[PDB]
Design a protein around this ligand. Structure first.
Ligand SMILES: *Cc1c(COP(=O)(O)O)cnc(C)c1O
Ligand SMILES: *Cc1c(COP(=O)(O)O)cnc(C)c1O
Ligand SMILES: [Mn+2]
Ligand SMILES: [Mn+2]
Lengths: 322, 321
């Protein structure tokens, strides 16, 4: 029973990040409660700094490096990202006063790149040729003597994410289950370690697009089974597969994985928009879709109080489904 | 000096409705503060039951006007107003165990008729004659022994709306001004009465589309001056002109009216969506638009803490600008 993080790592992460992240509210909806047949509690990480929960893990993995003086601090951080991870890493870098660089091609949206240097990180353009971006990033690191930061599930990132569960437990002490969207698995793994240490009777459920169901298949097969090919889904925040760092935790401490169709993600996201007035991105609708899915009916009526993590609000408004 | 509601009406409204309405939170945005150059406080009535503040006035209208015996309670409610008022009134009627009727023009959109049925009101049809409408209304009123509940001119409705300001004063103790979207003027009138009673040093500003600028024009001219023609604006919640009951209060107790273009409303609404992740309807973006407008730069630098009323979140997600 060895995992990359412990409960202690999550408590330390809490102390490390508390002054720089929002302790986000839990909101409720009577009408959503009646549709689900459960008492629903929405943990509002869409209100978090940068528009998603990411900042938690990213700040803990950047701030928890300085030994004391200005000798073991990163000279610079370099990334490709562009999405929610990019926004998180960059903001974390600004807070710590670390020069930050983002390598992007002419494919990312205007709103996203405006919100990527919205935290003052130098934008370097590489020609849209995939492997062309690797050489430019290596050149930045050469000049700065800094570090490359790619989308990660390092211990410090998982522990930072676990802090969501610490707040949920204080905000809804009678919670019977947490429902968490799953991509690389960092969020659900951190929550799982936290929840199962403090209150082992509370359920931890993963929510996953069926078009990107590596986590579901992994649990089924009993071994790490990453996506065959880059999945196509509106839930763009959960496209990456679970990894070596999150698999053991997901295998043992996540009670079940609930898959949801593209239509179910769309309906659920629209439902939150219309009844709760919360501008969640479709990835954050996955959790509600899981709670409303046919398969979730197998879950006990005793599991009445359910916390859904609304993981982000970074919607690309220039694009629409319905 | 003497108006259709008093401060006492507002306090009674609070007692009337407090067990059944949300005390909605005040949210802040540091990036919005930097854009505006002032400290902004967003009263989140979009989180209110039915998706707008109007539940406050609608419910107070039912619970207020009562001959105080077991034999003396409204037996039904009626309105010509569909949209936010119709939805709020129906919801309040259900709370009270009472039927609600919306007088609907027979040529109204299919989708609006379905939405009215969906939230539990009986539709009664009329001609768009503005003479047969009140004819059908008064016919229902007599049939049902019910009361007509106007969206903005009814005293009990105005009083209910003012309870917003009670919460704002408790939630933002150092508030310097409230910025309130104005349509019929029920909300701004109720808020003005409340603010000018409890802390008159606090400014009350009305925010209005220039495409529907009757409140601005009325204040300028010094008399009630309705919109000449139906307003053409994305702020669908504030198309109504101010009326006989709201004008006197606005005249004396509203400090100024700030007008905003359609592009300013659209941009400020998008700003709230993108920066705050709050799905406000464009009508609710009117207040922020006012704060960001060039004319608002004339407002004294002392007026630093500004509460903007995010009045509603009932946006039709089938059409984007
Ligand atoms: C990154 C992300 C996730 C998934 O979290 P993992 O830890 O990667 O599983 C879910 N939702 C949103 C909005 C995200 O940005
Ligand atoms: C009706 C309405 C208004 C205007 O209120 P009045 O009391 O008519 O001035 C503002 N915002 C929203 C969301 C509304 O529904
Ligand atoms: Mn997956
Ligand atoms: Mn007007």
């Amino acid at each position: 029973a060895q995992y990359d993080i412990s409960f202690a790592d999550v408590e330390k992460a809490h102390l490390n990040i508390q002054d720089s992240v929002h302790l986000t509210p839990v909101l409720t909806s009577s009408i959503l409660n009646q549709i689900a047949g459960r008492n629903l509690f929405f943990k509002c990480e869409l209100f978090q700094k940068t528009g998603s929960f990411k900042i938690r893990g990213a700040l803990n993995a950047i701030r928890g490096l300085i030994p004391d003086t200005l000798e073991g601090k990163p000279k610079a951080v370099v990334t490709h990202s562009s999405g929610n991870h990019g926004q998180a890493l960059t903001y974390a870098a600004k807070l710590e006063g670390i020069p930050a660089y983002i390598v992007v091609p002419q494919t990312a949206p205007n709103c996203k790149k405006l919100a990527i240097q919205a935290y003052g990180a130098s934008i370097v353009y590489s020609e849209p040729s995939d492997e062309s971006r690797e050489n430019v990033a290596q050149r930045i690191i050469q000049e700065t003597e800094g570090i490359l930061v790619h989308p990660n599930q390092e211990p410090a990132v998982i522990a930072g994410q676990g802090t969501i569960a610490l707040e949920v437990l204080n905000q809804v002490p009678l919670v019977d289950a947490l429902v968490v969207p799953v991509g690389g698995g960092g969020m659900v793994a951190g929550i799982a370690i936290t929840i199962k240490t403090l209150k082992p009777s509370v359920k931890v459920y993963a929510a996953e697009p069926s078009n990107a169901d590596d986590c579901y298949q992994s649990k089924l097969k009993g071994e790490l089974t990453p996506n065959l090919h880059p999945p196509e889904t509106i839930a763009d925040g959960v496209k990456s597969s679970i990894g070596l760092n999150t698999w053991p935790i997901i295998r043992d401490l996540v009670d079940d994985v609930f898959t949801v169709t593209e239509d179910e993600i769309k309906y659920a996201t629209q439902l939150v928009w219309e009844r709760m007035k919360l501008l969640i991105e479709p990835t954050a609708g996955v959790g509600l879709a899981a709670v409303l899915s046919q398969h979730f009916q197998t879950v006990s009526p005793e599991v009445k109080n359910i916390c859904i993590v609304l993981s982000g609000g970074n919607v690309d408004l220039t694009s629409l489904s319905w």
